[PDB]
Design a protein around this ligand. Structure first.
Ligand SMILES: [Fe+3]
Ligand SMILES: [Fe+3]
Ligand SMILES: [Mg+2]
Ligand SMILES: [Mg+2]
Lengths: 423, 423
């Protein structure tokens, strides 16, 4: 079994480091004064970057891999997506959900993702997708720690038996309580739905992740209730507000007042760049707003924010290979986090900040933690992002669970020359 | 020497095709009714997609590869970029320009790009970068047909001897006449500069490519003069309006009136997604406009529009590997061209439409044309874009000039499994 990771670079640290492993955990981390020789039981990072695993804080595994079945979304709109999904209803079975979820999970394992939070639609009396996902969670456990959010997609108060079904999902084992206040019939139902969500989270000791203000409506302010209730209950660390795309459209004075509460509350925020740029701004003609939440300002204020993929290869988002560096690339561009340090520090948005969002208790390259880490064939976060590098090795419990042999590119000039896209 | 390309898929065509080669040209293209066996002198596309070469219609090779020299742009702003470039002035020499241009050109060769249009700053009495680029053009000719635009970055009428220097650049061999009307001191200088640009293009029989309305100013309408002058001279095919980001901010009534002229004029448009999303919208607070020209509407109206990378690894854009599928990916998201057909047809924005922008006379998989083509390990444009596939083989004059051995990814579950990100 592997005993050491050598010649590793660490974000924010100078030089090379050696990570000692024992009994599936990291026993010690020591600085090197030069390059160490390889040997039996040593995994050579080759001066590449070593980081804790990538994290997917927001994905819908119940709908993944269904694009084009039975028909393709040709307009690309949300409206048509709903119609295309409806045409596939006859194929939505226990086994179908498990097969598709596992296909995307394998791409995630290949991409160094060891922690995933999936929302599962529980606005279904049969709870078909939820029952399937609970089995998938157990099956994939050796490779990925999967959290399941009971997501009442059609609303809690605006759908028949919505609250009873949400609670049933928690009784069956869902890890997180979801909500979608802006989709409820009225603002009052929206606010009330959040009180019910928090009461359920406290009753069952579960986390909360709300699809919050995902709409280009400057009056959609459910985020202040999410933060206020979290502050009142002293549970900010266990609470997440996903999307908050309406914040992109708020006036600055209200946003400034709100930020004081967001910081005090300690809640987490998830932005989903690939999907937000695609589905937001659809009611504008020109100019067209970007529609991503205030990521740059959150970072400047010390508010925890991170990035999710949201959807993969389905009616709502036809693209994706479940790659977090690709999600990060889009977010840095749309949010204009394009200075060198902003890009280099970008890795935090898909590693540490996401681990905090999932309330993980065993995460990070530190002595005593499980030996879960990945190796990128790049010098730092900037280099990894610019070249969109694959994950050379993914290690979990001190064992290799994925590896990618890099592509090899050659140009035939006066003589053959290898191209690695470095200067 | 290669005599045939077999088992090729072609955009918009059903089945597999065989492309016969002779004397460096395509002699014939025949449909196959099944998979053909490989043999000596046959390049097997393996049911991958075969297309004419990728094209880079807009890049600045004179500034490429300089990010972080001597310092990094930390804010990511245009203003700081200008300052960082100024700090590198002592290093700007003939040999330095050639070395950096060649580094990016090699990445382009590796990425299947055989046609490149580079703008070169000619607001320099010594014309240092231009002299260097003219040598690079000759040196790279066996692999890339490089067009050089004499770009008067500081203006034609607003910079000392601007017009004389622009003409000197044409006398030295620049292929295209540039301009930048919105940067001139006054609207009147802007309009006058375009009359001078067109007069020079007609005097020397050169193409035109204007940095046109690259500003979030709803009153920047130099594009109507570019189109009107092209229509008057009957030379639309030889004219390009780059950026036109101001169009993102025009009212709809004026845009509708303008579109009639744009179509009638026959001029070309270049949008630069990676740079436009980064540098446009910088004066907005929230909401923030996207700032890309009206690509979707141009396509719907039959107006030729295509995508360029603009900058690679420099103070104005720190990222990039000169990859056109990456440029396309950003453009499809920001322009909301996310329906299946829109994405699949996306390849046109980085192949055929760009060839038209460069007024190329030998381009396309057709009998009689030079055997210049590339092979993508994907089923169609959608698949190539989704998986961001590399160029398996680039063929020029019937000879392989670049090849990429794909990466190999494995996940170690109960048994090892190869992952190719296909469902
Ligand atoms: Fe979601
Ligand atoms: Fe330019
Ligand atoms: Mg959604
Ligand atoms: Mg520019």
């Amino acid at each position: 079994a592997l005993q050491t990771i050598i010649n590793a670079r660490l974000p924010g640290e100078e030089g090379l480091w050696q990570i000692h492993l024992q009994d599936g955990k990291i026993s010690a981390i020591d600085a090197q004064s030069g390059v160490m020789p390889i040997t039996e039981n040593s995994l050579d990072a080759e001066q590449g970057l070593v980081i804790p695993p990538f994290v997917e804080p927001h994905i819908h595994l119940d709908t993944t891999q269904t694009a084009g079945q039975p028909n393709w979304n040709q307009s690309g709109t949300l409206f048509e997506g709903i119609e295309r999904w409806a045409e596939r209803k006859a194929l939505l079975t226990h086994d179908d959900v498990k097969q598709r979820a596992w296909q995307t999970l394998k791409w995630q394992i290949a991409n160094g993702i060891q922690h995933v939070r999936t929302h599962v639609d529980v606005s279904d009396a049969t709870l078909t997708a939820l029952k399937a996902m609970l089995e998938v969670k157990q099956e994939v456990a050796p490779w990925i720690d999967l959290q399941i959010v009971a997501f009442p997609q059609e609303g809690i108060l605006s759908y028949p038996n919505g609250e009873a079904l949400l609670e049933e999902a928690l009784r069956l084992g869902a890890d997180v309580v979801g909500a979608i206040p802006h989709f409820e019939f009225t603002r009052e139902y929206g606010v009330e739905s959040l009180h019910k969500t928090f009461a359920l989270a406290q009753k069952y000791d579960r986390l909360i992740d709300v699809h919050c203000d995902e709409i280009d409506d400057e009056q959609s302010r459910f985020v202040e209730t999410v933060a206020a209730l979290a502050h009142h209950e002293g549970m900010g660390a266990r609470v997440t507000a996903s999307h908050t795309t309406a914040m992109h459209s708020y006036n600055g004075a209200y946003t400034s007042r709100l930020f004081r509460l967001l910081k005090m509350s300690g809640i987490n925020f998830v932005a989903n760049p690939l999907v937000n740029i695609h589905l937001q701004g659809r009611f504008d003609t020109y100019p067209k707003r970007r529609g991503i939440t205030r990521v740059k300002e959150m970072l400047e204020s010390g508010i925890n924010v991170c990035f999710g993929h949201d959807s993969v290869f389905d009616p709502w988002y036809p693209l994706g290979t479940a790659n977090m560096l690709q999600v990060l690339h889009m977010g840095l561009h749309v949010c204009q986090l394009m200075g060198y340090g902003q890009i280099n520090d970008g890795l935090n948005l898909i590693t540490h900040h996401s681990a905090r969002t999932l309330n993980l208790q065993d995460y990070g390259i530190a002595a005593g933690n499980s030996a879960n880490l990945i190796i990128l064939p790049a010098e730092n976060g900037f280099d990894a992002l610019r070249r969109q590098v694959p994950v050379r090795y993914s290690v979990r419990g001190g064992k290799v669970i994925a590896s990618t042999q890099p592509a090899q590119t050659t140009v035939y000039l006066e003589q053959p020359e290898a191209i690695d896209y470095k200067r």
